[PDB]
Amino acid sequence: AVPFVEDWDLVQTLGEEVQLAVNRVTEEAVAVKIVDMENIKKEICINKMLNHENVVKFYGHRREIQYLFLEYCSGGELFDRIEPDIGMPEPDAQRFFHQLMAGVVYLHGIGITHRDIKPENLLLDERDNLKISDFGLATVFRYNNRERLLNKMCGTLPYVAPELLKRREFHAEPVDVWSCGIVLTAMLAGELPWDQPSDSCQEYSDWKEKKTYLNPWKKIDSAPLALLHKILVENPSARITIPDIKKDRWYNKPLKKG
Ligand SMILES: C[C@H](OC(=O)Nc1ccc(Cl)c(Cl)c1)c1nc2ccccc2[nH]1
């Protein structure tokens, strides 16, 4: 074994903590999540389940203050790529949305729901490949092929699905689909549509009344807007599922060169 190979230097804070760690010998870069301690114990267990190119990789943890060794994403947060009131070019948004769907399909396939999808939690590597990040709110919604309904209110209000605010229990998967829809809206409009999806929120009422001549909707082309009409559906049982998102016209529209 090579001496010093287990030493990592903390080179800079990534966000309050998360530190950029660089290996003393190989100079490999990883992100180290440092948390001063059960909620963290659940995060580690779920992270140990994960292995997908669009999910932040988990390398392991040191017990010691908990240390989480995570995939370093040098491109930063998707959040920062969104220009206020503008968004980003549609081809870039579609590519990010494809990779988001890939990561969410993977998590749902192993029975995990993230529960807080938003641009702050979608990170980018050196090639701007998207990675779903931070499973501190994640939980199991399917185990031994049996679905468990959720009831814990959590997430982030502008991104959260209406059923969470309205119903005692709800299916996990439609909630993640909804937040992905809000992320898509943010990417294409550079603004979030409403403070929260409540009947008291005027902007949300305007949407249910199909007033798409207003912002953010009028900034969005008809093709992606049509997908958003199928995702941001109030009734989670009527809301489009991911298999059907994969069949959507805009989702399959050639837009971006390699
Ligand atoms: C870093 C800063 O981020 C944002 O403003 N984030 C942001 C804006 C709207 C929404 Cl709805 C969301 Cl979720 C995020 C930024 N990024 C830029 C890109 C080009 C030009 C100016 C820019 N300012």
Report which of 13, 61, 8 is spatially closest to residue 37, judged by C-alpha positions: 61
Nearest CA to ligand 1 atom 22: 83
Name 156's Cβ contacts closer than 8 Å, sequence gap at least 6: 116, 118
Under 8 Å between Cβ of 11 and 22: yes
State both tokens at 6: 């287990």
To the question of domain 1-83 being in CATH 2.60.40.10, the answer is no
- State how far the Cα of 175 lies from the Cα of 160, in Å rounded to an integer: 7
CATH number, span 84-258:
1.10.510.10
Q: Which atom of ligand 1 is nearest to the CA of 86?
A: 9
The Cα angle at residue 80 between residues 93 and 139, in degrees rounded to 5:
80
Of 78, 80, 215, the residue with max ligand 1 atoms within 8 A of its CB, to mutate for a pocket test, comes to 80
Question: How many angstroms does the Cα of residue 78 sit away from the middle of ligand 1?
Answer: 9
**Residue 159 to residues 165, 174, 227, Cα–Cα distance (Å):** 12, 12, 17
Q: Residues with catalytic annotation?
A: 116
How many residues are given for the chain? 258
State both tokens at 197: 């999806």
Q: Where are the domains of the chain?
A: 1-83, 84-258
What is the DSSP code (8-state) at residue 119? G
Nearest CA to ligand 1 atom 21: 83
Question: How many angstroms does the Cα of residue 141 sit away from the middle of ligand 1?
Answer: 33
Under 8 Å between Cβ of 58 and 47: yes
Provide the 3-class DSSP secondary structure of residue 25.
coil
CA R_g for the chain: 19
Provide the 3-class DSSP secondary structure of residue 83.
strand
Under 8 Å between Cβ of 93 and 184: yes
Provide the 3-class DSSP secondary structure of residue 162.
helix
Under 8 Å between Cβ of 225 and 217: yes
Nearest CA to ligand 1 atom 17: 83
Name 255's Cβ contacts closer than 8 Å, sequence gap at least 6: 90, 91, 94
Under 8 Å between Cβ of 106 and 49: no
Q: Using a 6 Å cutoff on CB, does residue 82 contact ligand 1?
A: yes
To which residue do tokens 């990883």 refer? 30
- State how far the Cα of 116 lies from the Cα of 179, in Å rounded to an integer: 8
Instruction: State residue 176 phi and psi, 5-degree precision.
Output: -65, -35
**Residue 52 to residues 130, 166, 176, 254, Cα–Cα distance (Å):** 11, 33, 17, 25
Q: Using a 6 Å cutoff on CB, does residue 105 contact ligand 1?
A: no
Instruction: State residue 246 phi and psi, 5-degree precision.
Output: -65, -15
To which residue do tokens 């992606």 refer? 224
Nearest CA to ligand 1 atom 2: 80
- State how far the Cα of 201 lies from the Cα of 257, in Å rounded to an integer: 39
State both tokens at 29: 């870069």
Resolution for this experimental structure (Å):
1.8
Alpha helices in 17-89 (DSSP H): 39-47
State both tokens at 41: 């114990």
At position 58, the amino acid (one-letter code) is F
Q: Is 85 left (phi over 0), alpha (psi -120 to 50) or beta?
A: left
Binding residues for ATP: 14-18, 33
Report which of 132, 117, 92, 247 is spatially closest to residue 183, judged by C-alpha positions: 117
- State how far the Cα of 117 lies from the Cα of 130, in Å rounded to an integer: 12
